[PDB]
Amino acid sequence: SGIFRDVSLLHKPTTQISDFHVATRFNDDFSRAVLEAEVQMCGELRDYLRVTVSLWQGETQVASGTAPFGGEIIDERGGYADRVTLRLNVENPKLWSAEIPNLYRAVVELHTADGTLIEAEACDVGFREVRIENGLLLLNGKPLLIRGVNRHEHHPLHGQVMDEQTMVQDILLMKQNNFNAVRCSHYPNHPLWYTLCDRYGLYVVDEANIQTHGMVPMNRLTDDPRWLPAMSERVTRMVQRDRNHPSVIIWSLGNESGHGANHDALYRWIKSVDPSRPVQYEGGGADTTATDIICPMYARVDEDQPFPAVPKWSIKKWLSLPGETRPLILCEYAHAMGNSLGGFAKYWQAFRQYPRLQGGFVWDWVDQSLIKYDENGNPWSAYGGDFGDTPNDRQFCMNGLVFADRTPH
Amino acid sequence: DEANIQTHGMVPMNRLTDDPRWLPAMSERVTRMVQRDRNHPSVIIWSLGNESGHGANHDALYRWIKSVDPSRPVQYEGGGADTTATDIICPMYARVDEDQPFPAVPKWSIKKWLSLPGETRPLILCEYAHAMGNSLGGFAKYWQAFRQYPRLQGGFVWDWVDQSLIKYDENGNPWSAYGGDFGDTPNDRQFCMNGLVFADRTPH
Ligand code: NA
Ligand code: NA
Ligand code: NA
Ligand code: NA
Numbered sequence: 001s002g003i004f005r006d007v008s009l010l011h012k013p014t015t016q017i018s019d020f021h022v023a024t025r026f027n028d029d030f031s032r033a034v035l036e037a038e039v040q041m042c043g044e045l046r047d048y049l050r051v052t053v054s055l056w057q058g059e060t061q062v063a064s065g066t067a068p069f070g071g072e073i074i075d076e077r078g079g080y081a082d083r084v085t086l087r088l089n090v091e092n093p094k095l096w097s098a099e100i101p102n103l104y105r106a107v108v109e110l111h112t113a114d115g116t117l118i119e120a121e122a123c124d125v126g127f128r129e130v131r132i133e134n135g136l137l138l139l140n141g142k143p144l145l146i147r148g149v150n151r152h153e154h155h156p157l158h159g160q161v162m163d164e165q166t167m168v169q170d171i172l173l174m175k176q177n178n179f180n181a182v183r184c185s186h187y188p189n190h191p192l193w194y195t196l197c198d199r200y201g202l203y204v205v206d207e208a209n210i211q212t213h214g215m216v217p218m219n220r221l222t223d224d225p226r227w228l229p230a231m232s233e234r235v236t237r238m239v240q241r242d243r244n245h246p247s248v249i250i251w252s253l254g255n256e257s258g259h260g261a262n263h264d265a266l267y268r269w270i271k272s273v274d275p276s277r278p279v280q281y282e283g284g285g286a287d288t289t290a291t292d293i294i295c296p297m298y299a300r301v302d303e304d305q306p307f308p309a310v311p312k313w314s315i316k317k318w319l320s321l322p323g324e325t326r327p328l329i330l331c332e333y334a335h336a337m338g339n340s341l342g343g344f345a346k347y348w349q350a351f352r353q354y355p356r357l358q359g360g361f362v363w364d365w366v367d368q369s370l371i372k373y374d375e376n377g378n379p380w381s382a383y384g385g386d387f388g389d390t391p392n393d394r395q396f397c398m399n400g401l402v403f404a405d406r407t408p409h
Numbered sequence: 410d411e412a413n414i415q416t417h418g419m420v421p422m423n424r425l426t427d428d429p430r431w432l433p434a435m436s437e438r439v440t441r442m443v444q445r446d447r448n449h450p451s452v453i454i455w456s457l458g459n460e461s462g463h464g465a466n467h468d469a470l471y472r473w474i475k476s477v478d479p480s481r482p483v484q485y486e487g488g489g490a491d492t493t494a495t496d497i498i499c500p501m502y503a504r505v506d507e508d509q510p511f512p513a514v515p516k517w518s519i520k521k522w523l524s525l526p527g528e529t530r531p532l533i534l535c536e537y538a539h540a541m542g543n544s545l546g547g548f549a550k551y552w553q554a555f556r557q558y559p560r561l562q563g564g565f566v567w568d569w570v571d572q573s574l575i576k577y578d579e580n581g582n583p584w585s586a587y588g589g590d591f592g593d594t595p596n597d598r599q600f601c602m603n604g605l606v607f608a609d610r611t612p613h
Binding site: 134135136304314316317319320321322323325353354355356 | 508518520521523524525526527529557558559560
């Protein structure tokens with residue numbers, strides 16, 4: 001507990017940019033793109049107010065557009081007087097991917113007609129399309145093979161406080177070991193994480209801070225309409241924050257909270273506000289109406305585990321169940337606890353052979369051990385139960401591919 | 410129930426079946442079969458023939474049966490076992506786990522075949538487990554997969570009975586004869602004997 005992320009002060013003008021959304025649409029062979037930027041304002045509307053959106057490739061301006069406020073008519077009562085949408089044509093765009101993280105810079109200027117700047121906001125833009133077609137997750141028209149890992153925010157000394165150096169160290173080690181994807185298990189991350197994933201090139205699953213694993217049954221809160229407000233906030237405010245990051249390719253509704261009606265509602269909310277990213281969620285059997293991707297945890301390659309209500313089928317078998325058409329990407333697989341990763345090769349042989357088996361996220365990146373000091377003041381790695389907490393679950397917090405200090409297993 | 414159409418020797422295999430000038434002759438082999446056997450409850454599936462590639466004539470005759478008799482699925486293996494002329498993915502000698510990616514007409518692993526992008530059909534092998542001589546090694550592997558995968562709904566072994574004929578030597582004692590023993594040339598050795606039983610119905 002505590003104040004474990006940054007505290008800051010921000011000064012905005014009274015007349016201000018209050019929100020902006022960046023979209024990139026493409027023609028059939030990705031040789032032409034349109035950058036669409038919706039900008040919202042707060043404060044007093046004046047006829048002399050303007051928004052300029054410029055796009056930059058390094059130091060070279062590729063496009064620019066200016067418009068006064070006033071959106072298109074949307075219903076009987078007119079449109080948004082406090083909004084404007086700018087559209088910029090981009091020929092032969094340099095496309096973003098984990099392989100080549102090509103980035104542009106979009107600059108949003110709020111100003112007056114005479115050219116006096118009020119304020120500016122900006123973001124990194126990655127020209128990429130994410131879609132599921134014919135049962136395959138495609139990035140820029142090509143089927144992904146997810147070499148992923150789950151990564152909690154953990155430091156052996158500072159706990160759940162994250163820093164740039166630790167983040168960069170993780171990304172370098174991940175990419176040096178042929179990972180191209182990360183799952184934010186199980187919450188929105190420190191804001192810098194996404195910036196670094198944009199720039200270094202990693203596919204991100206951004207996950208709402210909703211886990212109710214201790215509930216009996218697991219969906220007791222998530223099927224309760226009285227908990228829909230609280231859950232909606234955890235999903236909506238995540239999307240509102242992170243929607244402009246190119247590295248985020250998939251939204252997740254949370255983790256291990258069963259499957260409730262609130263999941264279906266919030267699944268639809270995201271599909272409505274952001275059609276650019278698939279939505280996934282594992283709860284309630286990994287293949288519910290709240291997920292675009294079959295995303296089981298610890299389903300085996302060839303071996304069925306036919307649990308009541310929530311079976312974990314063989315991943316090869318799961319794909320071809322009567323009526324099933326979706327891609328399968330394990331949200332968690334290959335539990336890396338201690339001397340482990342036995343049978344890891346069996347997954348990858350299956351991933352390569354089966355088009356619709358598109359990889360998964362290893363559990364997990366780093367051991368969640370903390371440093372304690374003995375009678376002599378010497379450091380040692382401590383797990384659950386070493387701090388005096390009871391009931392505890394012993395060494396079950398250490399399931400990482402790297403030690404807490406980032407030394408490889 | 411399978412139409413009397415096989416053009417396996419053609420190069421390519423669909424040379425006749427894609428030729429509209431052969432549609433009349435092909436149509437009669439399909440239509441007159443349906444007209445004869447359509448009241449038999451034992452017949453659950455119509456087949457358009459065997460090893461004749463995939464031509465436009467198959468598509469037309471597929472549709473003819475569907476219009477005339479909606480009560481039975483239509484299958485056909487030619488042209489890669491999953492063409493627009495078949496309701497059932499019906500390969501011959503597709504293996505359980507091992508892909509055989511031949512150009513144009515691959516024989517995928519049957520488990521893999523089911524979940525190819527956009528694929529939804531049942532898979533039943535029109536021919537599998539070639540029982541030529543000392544054979545049927547790996548038969549258990551098919552049956553384990555059939556039982557595990559709902560949409561793997563079995564197959565038809567090749568085949569029932571050795572196609573050997575009775576010849577008599579100098580003493581008048583009978584012996585089982587195959588291709589080449591009747592002076593026939595060119596012949597293909599003992600490839601006519603792929604049966605689970607001998608010609609006299611004694612089990613292998
Ligand atoms: Na794959
Ligand atoms: Na754990
Ligand atoms: Na079956
Ligand atoms: Na034969």
